[PDB]
Design a protein around this ligand. Structure first.
Ligand SMILES: CCCCCCCCCCCCCCCCCC(=O)OC[C@H](CO[C@@H]1O[C@H](CO[C@H]2O[C@H](CO)[C@H](O)[C@H](O)[C@H]2O)[C@H](O)[C@H](O)[C@H]1O)OC(=O)CCCCCCCCCCCCCCCCC
Ligand code: CLA
Ligand code: CLA
Ligand code: CLA
Ligand code: CLA
Ligand code: CLA
Ligand code: CLA
Ligand code: CLA
Ligand SMILES: CC1=C(C#C/C(C)=C/C=C/C(C)=C/C=C/C=C(C)/C=C/C=C(C)/C=C/C2=C(C)CCCC2(C)C)C(C)(C)C[C@H](O)C1
Ligand SMILES: CC1=CCCC(C)(C)[C@H]1/C=C/C(C)=C/C=C/C(C)=C/C=C/C=C(C)/C=C/C=C(C)/C=C/C1=C(C)CCCC1(C)C
Ligand SMILES: CCCCCCCCCCCCO[C@H]1O[C@H](CO)[C@@H](O[C@H]2O[C@H](CO)[C@@H](O)[C@H](O)[C@H]2O)[C@H](O)[C@H]1O
Lengths: 33, 659, 30, 173, 180, 90, 143, 80
């Protein structure tokens, strides 16, 4: 696989960092007055 | 709390109900605070742009993930032995045996085996390498960006369209019929003639040479001379090897009919003439309505003028024009119904007449495609009826529809629902009685006592299409019929060769089990239609609740009074009909998969003997074919099916949670 | 086969599409 | 009121006599279907193209341009048409007449709004319409020669189809 | 009433004659759909590029900078023989001139707020313009030479595409004896 | 709600009489019923004749009979228009 | 300092290099076909491998030879590629000195085609080797 | 808060007021019925939406009607 480092870089990012920030910012948005 | 900014009542909710109801009403723009019709239409236009961009991004992602992690260049060379790869696996929760067991397709990393059939489609339309797959992915990324920019632009001031532009029925119909249907079909025929057919004959055509590589040796001179039949001369030989010049023809437009004998798929020249003809027919349809130049038809006059003078339809179609133009839900129901009908048509006709090379031998791909598009069809039809019910709740004006066809539906809604109930109970009583009767007589050791009705009507239809199995000797199965002599010079040899060969799914032989399962399918369709029609027609009110239209399309109940009013809304009728839709697609897919597995195994008599009773379905289809699925992982090891072995159980968990 | 530069070009186009999608979402949100 | 050309038939309702050559000849009632201005544009365009075609057939029997005789050989009249699709004459002429007929399409769009006389392109470089009676006389002569040229082109081309000689080669023997 | 250039068509309402070079020639009605100032700015920019292009093709066909990449007289093949970096240098200088002369307003709505007359980039180093009677004639000659150079550059570049001889080379090489 | 737009020249053609008004025939509103009936008979004959020439379809069909076969569905609308004009006093 | 023609030349050379490196896959596949328990020629695999890879090899070699003989008029100086009409102002691609290997490889195709009908494994192997050597010679002479 | 309406089909039987657990309705003077009284809903901010009043109403299809709307702490019956 050409650029085989990209799955190992992006899958942890997309699966843990993206949903964590999305849930945190959505929580902040929906709970703020 | 200002998350649901579109609902002040929801934003003042002090509980967790606010988040859920803001999530479920976020795209219900008609119910929002202070929504005007022009703002509604502009938001809908931009949302439609966004969905188009999402579709283009998904297709570009499929193309890119194949160009990067697939085996397309290996698969083109050996299509019938190499397993197609959908995308790569990177899961850090895997152990080493799971890494080993998913390493298939001739690559050195774990992969998923593709079931979507994108390999056959992309190979048939002329892609051969990974480079053009990546270029197509780039083009669709650019196109998605263009449509995102258009969605932003057509919401900007001095570009926001007016309500007269959105409700221009004649202009939108003419442009979408002539250009979106017609010219798109003509361009796809052009792509098939110019690119796909030469690449099918082993000669490379790309953007670098398509202006110097003629699709036909005579050029466009036979088209401009009116000697069009020169394009029908020298078709592909029955010895043609797809993707090579060996046995290749020079024709670009034929109507040969049947299947290519090697790919078991439709001739590409037939597809090119089909899409050319579809473009011509649709452009002729797309000049019908008057937009700016006096000629053309007026839609309002056509609707008002077609009132039968006997008065059986009342006022006819008077007021349907304003009712349809003013209601987006009536339009949405019509569109969803028509879309569901044609995706059912796609599901039946693509297994029966496949167009993609070597896809008739990919059994998993055919099963996945049929099941997918049939479930989409059930969802679309249920949505059509649901949004029709919403049209009765929100948009139906009786005073604008005095003695209309819609009003007369409402005036004999009770007869419609009662006769739907009668036919549903009829079908269920006697179909279940025959099935249980056959079960009881087979269990008692007497299968000769079964009630087995031969489906002679559909067999007569098959013989009318040319099937000589049943000996009916009528129409195309008669060598002296006027239809046979009419079509003998054009399409009859290839069609008769394809329909009378038992190597494809063209008009498969049918017996008493086929009879019973189609009448069960009729039962399920009529019962789902009963639930949906009864929900739509009682949406405005019933004897138990005559003011239901004051309460909207969705509400929990009207309280325990008057005997109890649980699930009385039309949304609740949608909710009840969803289970019946799942049941109907389940029965259809069970029939399709069991029949096709028994034919592919060479054991069609197992289906012919076991489908007449329920125990045959439970044992010879469900229990018998579950063995590799439940052995995807076991205490002795695991293999590549294990994920499905997980997902299966996953479904058995989550289904139960719904209860 | 596909090279690293081609994947980077696809990533740049996807980032441009991300910016356009964010702009469309902001326009729809008023 | 009966039609002047056909006395046993009723006068057409859409024929007033205000147009050149209007004697009330319309037995099949075509003027009731179409706009009369559109029909007169059709008649004038057919007649002018037929006048040019008749004059061209007569002249191409009379003499040929330098070099044409090697390109076309001895295949005069419509036989050259196919040949000149192999050469570039027909495509060039089709392109330039398509340009002129786009502008004629705009002119027809202005005719249908009641803001342009039928067949009026206002093309009078050499002034002949110096008097409103000479104008009517030239209109009647133009429409009569246009109809005569329609039937004359029909006769020349179909006689060429039968014999292969031409309009003036036939009269030589 | 009626347009001067086309007698049988009505005069376009946007073309009232205040702009120079007006004979009322808008048969397709682009003035009704698009702003006249934008169309005049586009006409002058297209014409100015075509004037520079026609003069460039004529002089490069006969006289060239000394190198083997620049020695081919034919314009289309000259575009491919010279280094592509130099084309990027042409593109970048054109881009900075486009960004500076427009005062960074390049959208349709933004050029004409704080509006300058169309085609005026405030460029006149020799200052022949100052006299108005000379100014109007200069304007008319610029519009007519721009249209004529659009036609001339089209004819030269397509004549290079058939012939491969350059403009005067094609002009001398009209073959009066061809089989067809 | 908002005014529903129509193209210019759209009239009210809703009818409850024996026949519709002639306006439903559009550009053929001024053609007499006899002309419609004669054209329907002539179209029926030409379309049937051309169709009967092209029932043994070949790979080189005659274009003229192909065009003339489209007069066969035309005659149905022609006799409907003949009935409409006959009961309209035309 | 490289022109557009030189860039197209480098792109074509890269395509030729890629296809030449693809050829030993067919070589190993045919050697696996020969070294089997029941040796049979997969005719379809060899024909499809030829029609994709060896055909694009010939097409890229022909375009490179055309750019070599004509120069900037073959890179776009004569306009878009055309079939019929006007008159070709381009020299034929046979006029290039580099066309000789181009004359070999194509006729070698027929051998492969004949071998695909004949079943001769070693004929396919030797003709694939001849294509590899002629591609290597072409690339190392063309520079 | 839920919306409670009283229509002029009310016969003034006072059953809906007696059935109300949240003291939302009350009887006011009226001349439209023989009882001389009609129900009224001045206190719909305390209405939970239980529809006991609708169950209690004896007139064929109901005279008192509850339309559920925006949910508040009182209308959700929350003791927290
Ligand atoms: C299936 C059944 C098929 C049966 C085919 C039968 C054919 C016989 C037609 C019957 C007589 C029709 C009478 C006629 O037409 O009626 C006469 C009318 C004139 O009508 C006038 O039309 C005016 C406005 O139209 C005009 O204005 C428009 C805008 O300028 C048009 O562009 C054009 O100018 C013209 O139509 C007003 O309506 C007036 O009331 C009226 O006087 O002719 C027109 O409208 C001119 C255009 C219509 C010509 C009809 C032939 C078209 C056939 C389509 C297929 C060929 C397509 C060619 C495309 C290339 C190949 C793909
Ligand atoms: C057939 C009718 C007709 C007539 C009588 C005219 C007449 C005229 N046009 Mg004109 N024109 C026409 C059609 C016509 N045009 C069409 C169909 C187009 C294309 C849409 C144009 C495009 C056009 C342009 C772009 C210009 C003119 C101009 C002119 C004027 C200069 C005279 C001349 O020879 O130029 C005619 C030149 C042409 C290229 C038109 C040729 C088309 C045919 C052959 C018409 C022949 C015109 C005739 C020789 C002159 C009549 C003289 C009359 C006043 C006594 C003149 C008033 C010029 C002018 O003064 O405007 C400011 C100018 O710039 N015309
Ligand atoms: C509508 C304006 C127009 C017209 C009529 C022509 C006409 C012509 N061009 Mg040209 N061209 C134009 C605009 C136009 N050009 C523009 C704007 C460009 C790009 C900047 C080009 C770039 C171009 C190249 C690179 C070549 C031509 C060529 C040709 C000739 C053959 C036609 C061909 O190959 O398709 C035209 C090819 C294109 C790439 C142009 C497509 C885009 C334009 C706008 C569409 C024009 C199509 C036109 C109707 C075709 C007319 C001929 C038709 C009867 C067959 C012909 C003389 C060829 C030639 O001379 O061969 C020796 C050739 O190699 N043209
Ligand atoms: C697609 C998303 C995703 C991804 C990429 C992973 C990835 C992983 N999981 Mg996993 N997991 C997921 C979804 C995912 N999981 C879900 C949905 C569940 C619920 C069913 C689980 C439940 C689960 C369990 C129960 C366990 C894992 C474990 C693991 C690790 C494998 C063992 C190993 O070598 O790590 C060795 C472990 C490490 C190197 C520690 C990594 C610590 C990270 C880098 C710190 C980052 C913190 C945070 C993200 C910073 C940003 C905060 C912000 C989001 C707010 C691996 C990192 C195992 C493990 O080892 O975790 C301890 C383990 O025990 N997962
Ligand atoms: C010719 C001009 C033209 C064209 C091409 C379009 C095209 C379109 N318009 Mg449209 N429109 C036009 C003029 C035009 N419009 C005019 C003049 C007006 C003003 C009166 C409008 C007003 C308008 C509105 C108000 C809306 C659109 C919308 C749309 C889009 C529909 C969604 C879509 O992509 O479906 C694609 C559909 C097709 C390709 C054809 C239908 C396909 C059917 C199902 C058969 C195909 C089956 C086939 C076998 C499948 C093969 C593929 C398979 C192998 C995968 C589409 C892009 C909608 C939209 O999404 O907005 C962004 C919308 O809301 N239009
Ligand atoms: C296997 C499960 C099952 C069965 C048999 C039924 C049966 C029925 N449903 Mg139903 N339904 C089900 C599951 C089921 N439902 C589920 C899970 C949902 C989702 C919530 C629905 C949602 C649903 C809706 C929304 C509607 C129905 C309707 C119907 C009736 C008409 C359909 C039909 O075939 O009529 C034929 C009837 C049958 C086949 C029932 C069996 C008849 C038995 C075998 C007769 C013999 C009885 C026996 C002698 C009794 C002896 C017992 C004694 C000794 C104690 C019918 C009574 C519709 C209706 O009422 O239409 C009029 C309707 O509107 N159902
Ligand atoms: C039989 C009855 C009859 C009569 C008396 C006429 C009489 C006339 N027609 Mg006429 N016509 C008729 C039937 C008839 N038509 C029919 C059936 C058609 C076909 C639908 C036509 C088509 C027609 C056209 C197209 C034209 C006339 C014209 C004329 C007039 C010129 C006279 C002329 O040149 O005679 C010679 C006529 C013919 C040789 C053809 C008609 C043949 C019939 C059978 C002989 C009638 C001759 C007539 C008695 C001569 C009149 C005597 C005197 C006034 C000269 C004249 C008033 C012309 C005119 O000015 O009107 C606009 C004209 O252009 N007619
Ligand atoms: C589309 C029509 C057409 C065609 C196909 C030709 C074709 C030809 N012309 Mg030509 N020509 C035409 C119209 C046409 N011309 C017109 C309208 C004129 C203006 C009067 C001329 C004036 C002309 C001259 C003056 C000469 C040719 C010559 C030639 C021939 C060149 C070969 C040769 O004999 O030397 C060539 C076959 C040459 C020749 O020798 O022909 C005999 C020549 O000297 N042409
Ligand atoms: C270019 C080209 C081609 C061509 C071609 C061409 C140029 C074809 C041209 C055809 C033309 C111009 C036909 C005209 C027909 C006229 C008729 C029928 C008149 C009827 C009169 C009637 C009914 C009645 C008249 C009347 C009479 C007597 C009595 C009643 C009253 C009145 C109305 C006055 C191809 C395709 C063939 C091929 C070739 O390779 C290239
Ligand atoms: C409830 C709700 C309220 C209001 C809104 C709403 C959207 C309207 C509605 C929702 C409504 C529902 C969803 C409405 C949508 C409904 C259903 C899906 C309509 C199905 C139509 C099938 C047609 C008639 C044809 C089959 C072909 C026939 C002509 C062929 C014959 C022949 C052909 C030529 C070819 C060969 C075969 C043979 C047989 C020989
Ligand atoms: C009265 C009107 C009669 C009919 C007029 C219209 C007929 C059809 C016109 C077609 C368009 C013009 O056609 C003109 O350009 C075409 C494209 O260069 C030419 O077509 C030629 O070149 C094409 C492109 O390589 C080749 O595919 C063709 O085989 C070749 O014949 C036509 O030979 C020429 O006549």
């Amino acid at each position: 696989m050409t650029a085989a480092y990209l799955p190992s870089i992006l899958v942890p990012i997309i699966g843990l960092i993206f949903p964590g920030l999305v849930m945190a910012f959505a929580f902040i948005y929906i709970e703020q007055d | 709390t200002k998350f649901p900014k579109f609902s002040q009542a929801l934003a003042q909710d002090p509980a967790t109900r606010r988040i859920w109801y803001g999530l479920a009403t976020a795209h219900d723009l008609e119910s929002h605070d202070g929504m005007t019709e022009e703002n509604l239409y502009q938001k809908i236009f931009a949302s439609h742009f966004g969905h188009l961009a999402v579709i283009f991004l998904w297709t570009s992602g499929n193309l890119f993930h194949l160009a990067w992690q697939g085996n397309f260049e290996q698969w083109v060379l050996n299509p019938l032995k190499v397993k197609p790869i959908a995308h790569a696996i990177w899961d850090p929760h895997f152990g080493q045996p799971a890494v080993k067991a998913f390493t298939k397709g001739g690559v050195s990393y774990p992969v998923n085996i593709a079931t979507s059939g994108v390999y056959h489609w992309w190979y048939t339309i002329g892609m051969r390498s990974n480079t053009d797959l990546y270029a197509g992915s780039l083009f669709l990324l650019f196109l998605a960006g263009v449509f995102l920019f258009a969605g932003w632009l057509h919401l900007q001031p001095k570009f926001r369209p007016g309500l007269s532009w959105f409700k221009n029925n004649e202009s939108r119909l003419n442009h979408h019929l002539s250009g979106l249907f017609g010219f798109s079909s003509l361009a796809w025929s052009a792509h098939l003639i110019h690119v796909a057919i030469p690449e099918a004959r082993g000669q490379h055509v790309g953007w670098d040479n398509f202006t110097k590589v003629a699709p036909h040796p005579a050029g466009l001179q036979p088209f401009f001379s009116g000697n069009w039949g020169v394009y029908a001369a020298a078709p592909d030989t029955t010895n043609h090897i797809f993707g090579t010049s060996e046995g290749a023809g020079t024709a670009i437009l034929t109507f040969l009919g049947g299947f290519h004998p090697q790919t078991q798929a439709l001739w590409l020249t037939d597809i090119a003439h089909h899409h050319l003809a579809i473009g011509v027919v649709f452009i002729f349809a797309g000049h019908m309505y008057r937009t700016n130049w006096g000629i053309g038809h007026s839609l309002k006059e056509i609707l008002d003028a077609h009132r039968p003078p006997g008065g059986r339809l009342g006022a006819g179609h008077k007021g349907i024009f304003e009712t349809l133009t003013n209601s987006l839900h009536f339009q949405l129901g019509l569109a969803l119904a028509s879309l569901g009908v044609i995706t059912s048509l796609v599901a039946q006709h693509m297994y029966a007449l496949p167009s993609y090379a070597f896809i008739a031998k990919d059994y998993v791909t055919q099963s996945a495609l049929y099941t997918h598009h049939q479930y989409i069809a059930g969802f679309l039809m249920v949505g059509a009826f649901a949004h029709g019910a919403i049209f009765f709740v929100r948009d139906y004006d009786p005073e604008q529809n005095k003695n209309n066809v819609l009003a007369r539906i409402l005036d004999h809604k009770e007869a419609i629902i009662s006769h739907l109930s009668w036919v549903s109970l009829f079908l269920g009583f006697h179909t279940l009685g025959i099935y249980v009767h056959n079960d009881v007589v087979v269990a008692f050791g007497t299968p000769e006592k079964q009630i087995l009705v031969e489906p002679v009507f559909a067999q007569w239809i098959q013989a009318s299409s040319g099937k000589a199995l049943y000996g009916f000797d009528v129409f195309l199965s008669s060598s002296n019929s006027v239809a046979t002599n009419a079509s003998s010079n054009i399409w009859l040899p290839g069609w008769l060769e394809a329909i009378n060969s038992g190597k494809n799914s063209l008009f498969l032989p049918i017996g008493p089990g086929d009879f019973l399962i189609h009448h069960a399918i009729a039962l399920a369709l009529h019962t789902t239609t009963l639930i949906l029609v009864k929900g739509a027609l009682d949406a405005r009110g019933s004897k138990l609740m005559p003011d239901k239209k004051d309460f909207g399309y969705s509400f929990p109940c009207d309280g325990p009074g008057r005997g109890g009013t649980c699930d009385i809304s039309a949304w609740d009728a949608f909710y009840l009909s969803m289970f019946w839709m799942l049941n109907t697609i389940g029965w259809v897919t069970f029939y399709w998969h069991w029949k096709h597995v028994t034919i592919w195994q060479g054991n069609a008599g197992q289906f012919n003997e076991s489908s007449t009773y329920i125990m045959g379905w439970l044992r010879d289809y469900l229990w018998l074919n579950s063995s590799p699925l439940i052995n995807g992982y076991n205490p002795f090891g695991m293999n590549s099916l294990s994920v499905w072995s997980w997902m299966f159980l996953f479904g058995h968990l989550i289904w139960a949670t719904g209860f | 086969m596909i090279s690293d530069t081609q994947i980077f070009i696809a990533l740049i186009l996807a980032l441009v599409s991300l910016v356009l999608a964010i702009r469309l979402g902001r326009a729809l949100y008023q | 009121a009966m039609s002047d050309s056909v006395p046993f038939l009723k006068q057409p309702e859409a024929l007033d006599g205000s147009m050149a050559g209007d004697v009330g000849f319309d037995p099949l009632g075509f003027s009731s279907i179409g706009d009369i201005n559109f029909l007169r544009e059709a008649e004038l365009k057919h007649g002018r193209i037929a006048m040019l075609a008749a004059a061209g057939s007569i002249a191409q029997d009379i003499f040929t341009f330098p070099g044409v005789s090697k390109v076309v050989g001895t295949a005069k009249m419509t036989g050259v048409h196919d040949i000149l699709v192999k050469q570039g004459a027909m495509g060039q002429l089709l392109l330039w007449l398509s340009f002129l007929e786009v502008f004629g399409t705009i002119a027809l769009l202005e005719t249908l709004d009641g803001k342009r006389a039928p067949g009026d392109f206002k093309f009078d470089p050499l002034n002949f319409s110096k008097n409103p009676e000479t104008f009517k006389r030239y209109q009647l002569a133009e429409i009569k020669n246009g109809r005569l040229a329609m039937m004359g082109v029909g006769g020349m081309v179909h006689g060429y189809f039968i014999t292969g000689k031409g309009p003036l080669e036939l009269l030589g023997n | 009433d009626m347009s001067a250039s086309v007698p049988f068509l009505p005069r376009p309402a946007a073309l009232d004659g205040s702009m120079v070079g007006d004979v009322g020639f808008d048969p397709l009605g682009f003035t009704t759909k698009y702003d006249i100032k934008w169309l005049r700015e586009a006409e002058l920019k297209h014409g100015r590029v075509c004037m520079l292009a026609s003069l460039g093709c004529i002089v490069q066909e006969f006289v060239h900078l000394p190198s083997e990449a620049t020695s081919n007289p034919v314009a289309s093949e000259a575009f491919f023989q010279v280094p592509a970096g130099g084309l990027w240098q042409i593109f970048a200088a054109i881009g900075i001139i486009e960004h500076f002369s427009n005062n960074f307003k390049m959208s349709g709505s933004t050029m004409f707020s704080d509006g300058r007359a169309p085609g005026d980039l405030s460029f006149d180093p020799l200052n022949f313009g100052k006299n108005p009677s000379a100014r109007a004639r200069y304007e008319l000659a610029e519009i007519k030479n721009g249209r004529l150079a659009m036609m001339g550059f089209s004819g030269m570049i397509h004549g290079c595409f058939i012939t491969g001889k350059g403009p005067l080379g094609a002009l001398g090489s009209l073959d009066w004896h061809q089989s067809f | 709600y908002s005014p529903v737009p129509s193209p210019e020249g759209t009239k009210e053609v809703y009818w409850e009489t024996k026949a519709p008004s002639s306006d439903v025939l559009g550009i053929g509103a001024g053609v007499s019923s006899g002309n419609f009936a004669a054209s329907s008979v002539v179209a029926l004959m030409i379309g049937g004749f051309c169709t009967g020439q092209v029932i043994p379809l070949t790979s080189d069909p005659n274009p003229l009979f192909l065009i003339g076969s489209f007069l066969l569905p035309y005659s149905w609308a022609l006799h409907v228009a003949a009935w409409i004009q006959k009961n309209n006093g035309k | 300092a490289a022109s557009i023609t030189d860039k197209q030349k480098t792109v074509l050379a890269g395509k030729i290099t890629v296809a030449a490196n693809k050829v030993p896959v067919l070589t190993a596949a045919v050697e696996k076909m020969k070294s089997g328990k029941k040796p049979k020629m997969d005719r379809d695999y060899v024909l499809r491998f030829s029609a994709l890879y060896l055909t694009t090899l010939v097409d890229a070699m022909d375009q490179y030879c055309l750019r070599d003989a004509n120069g900037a008029k073959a890179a776009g100086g004569a306009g878009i590629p055309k079939v019929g009409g006007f008159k070709s102002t381009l020299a034929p691609s046979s006029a290039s000195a580099l066309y000789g290997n181009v004359d070999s490889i194509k006729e070698d195709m027929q051998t492969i085609r004949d071998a695909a009908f004949k079943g001769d494994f070693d004929g396919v192997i030797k003709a694939a080797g001849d294509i590899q050597t002629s591609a290597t010679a072409f690339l190392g002479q063309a520079n | 808060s839920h919306s409670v309406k009283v229509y002029d089909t009310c016969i003034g039987c006072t059953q809906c007021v007696r059935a109300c657990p949240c003291d939302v309705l009350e009887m006011v003077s009226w001349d439209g019925c023989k009882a001389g009284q009609i129900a009224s809903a001045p206190r719909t901010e305390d209405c939970i939406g239980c529809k006991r009043c609708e169950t209690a109403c004896p007139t064929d299809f109901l005279s008192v009607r509850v339309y559920l709307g925006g949910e508040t702490t009182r209308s959700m019956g929350l003791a927290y």
